[PDB]
Amino acid sequence: RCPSVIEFGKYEIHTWYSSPYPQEYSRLPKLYLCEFCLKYMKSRTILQQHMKKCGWFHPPANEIYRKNNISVFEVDGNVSTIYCQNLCLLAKLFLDHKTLYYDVEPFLFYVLTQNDVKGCHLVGYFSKEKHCQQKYNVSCIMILPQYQRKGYGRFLIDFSYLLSKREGQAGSPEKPLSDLGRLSYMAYWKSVILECLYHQSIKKLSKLTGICPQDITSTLHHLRMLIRREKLIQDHMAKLQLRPVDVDPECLRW
Ligand SMILES: CC(=O)SCCNC(=O)CCNC(=O)[C@H](O)C(C)(C)COP(=O)(O)OP(=O)(O)OC[C@H]1O[C@@H](n2cnc3c(N)ncnc32)[C@H](O)[C@@H]1OP(=O)(O)O
Ligand SMILES: [Zn+2]
């Protein structure tokens, strides 16, 4: 409800939840954000004056992944604090609960961009705690509405496990999951398991995949495979081939 709509580059985005934008922006139906620095402003003309002095065309961070027109920037909440606070405020417009927006230091932010001649456009992000005893490989994940349901969410989840695999660890998303988070991960874990079985132990599956034992076990249970169900494997393999956004591990500079 507050705010209700944002203008974000060429996009009008309807918000899902309130976000605690600093007072006088918390009481505004519409916000105008710079698409590259995520600064919030109260009018189109103020945004237009800002685009004239803002020099950013991408996130203020190292690009750790690029393939064709897709990039991932690794942003450190300890270094690019303002930007990461602006990103958390944006994210909260599509999250029912987030931790308070100005403690970003404990996190790294993996920012997804679709790139063209006008720059690297924010699609979404996942955050990740630098030091985490629960071994959560994602704390938060968000794809902007205008890009939702195109495979960007799965790509990011896939990308989160590639980091896990490269740190020599199995990882898991932070719980509680939102309903949308639950559907996304379930959809991801099923397809990874079905595809691996098509192309092939739970501990071995865990090592190849970076998905933790718990999530494999419960996904296997959900599929009543905890035991190969050939019909289900074949049908999924037919569903696939019927993933244009897809992680290539060799494109990782990390
Ligand atoms: C770890 C956590 O913190 S949980 C928090 C999760 N994040 C949020 O709730 C923020 C708001 N939601 C979002 O940002 C997104 O919905 C995400 C990140 C969860 C998923 O992003 P998307 O880009 O939509 O992902 P993608 O297109 O890869 O879809 C993944 C699966 O979720 C399904 N899905 C996506 N949106 C919806 C929806 N509105 N209703 C039901 N299912 C949906 C897709 O159909 C797909 O399942 P399928 O393969 O069985 O069809
Ligand atoms: Zn800007």
Q: Which atom, in ligand 1's list, is nearest to the CA of 173?
A: 1
Residue 27 CA to residue 25 CA, distance in Å, equals: 5
With a CB cutoff of 8 Å and minimum separation 6, the contacts of 79 are 61
Q: Using an 8 Å Cβ cutoff, are 210 and 188 in contact?
A: no
Smallest CA-to-CA distance from 118 within 35, 47, 229 is with 35
Smallest CA-to-CA distance from 251 within 169, 170, 155 is with 155
Reduce the DSSP state of residue 245 to 3 states and report it: coil
Residue 36 CA to residue 83 CA, distance in Å, equals: 9
Residues with CB under 6 A from ligand 1: 94-95, 138, 140-143, 148-154, 173-174, 177-178, 180-181, 183-184, 187
With a CB cutoff of 8 Å and minimum separation 6, the contacts of 96 are 17, 178
Q: Using an 8 Å Cβ cutoff, are 11 and 34 in contact?
A: no
User: Which CA distances in Å does 22 have to 13, 127, 188, 241?
Assistant: 20, 22, 37, 47
Query: Would you put residue 211 in left (φ > 0), alpha (ψ -120 to 50) or beta?
Result: beta
Resolution in A: 2.3
| Token couple for 16 | 């899902």
From the options 3.40.50.970, 3.40.190.80, 1.10.10.10, 3.30.1330.40, give the CATH code of 177-234. 1.10.10.10
83 CA distance to ligand 2 centroid (A)?
10
The domain defined by 56-176+235-254 folds into: Aminopeptidase (3.40.630)
Quote the crossing angle between the two packed helices 230-239 and 179-199, to the nearest 10°.
110
146 forms bridges with which residues in the sheet?
A: none
Residue type, 43: S
For domain 1-55, give the CATH number: 3.30.60.60
Task: Give the residue, out of 182, 183, 191, with the most ligand 1 atoms within 8 A of its beta carbon, to mutate for a pocket test.
Answer: 183
Taking only Cα atoms into account, the Rg of the chain, rounded to an integer number of angstroms, comes to 19
Residue 37 CA to residue 52 CA, distance in Å, equals: 13
User: Which CA distances in Å does 195 have to 71, 132, 143, 186, 249?
Assistant: 25, 30, 24, 14, 17
Residue 244 CA to residue 28 CA, distance in Å, equals: 38
112 CA distance to ligand 2 centroid (A)?
17
Tell me how crowded residue 177 is: count the other CB atoms within 10 A of its CB. 15
**CA-nearest residue, atom 14 of ligand 1:** 142
Known binding positions: 139-143, 148-154, 178
Q: Containing H/E element for 70? A: strand 70-76
188 forms bridges with which residues in the sheet?
A: none
Phi, psi of 9 (to 5 degrees): 65, -130
Residue ranges of domains in the chain: 1-55, 56-176+235-254, 177-234
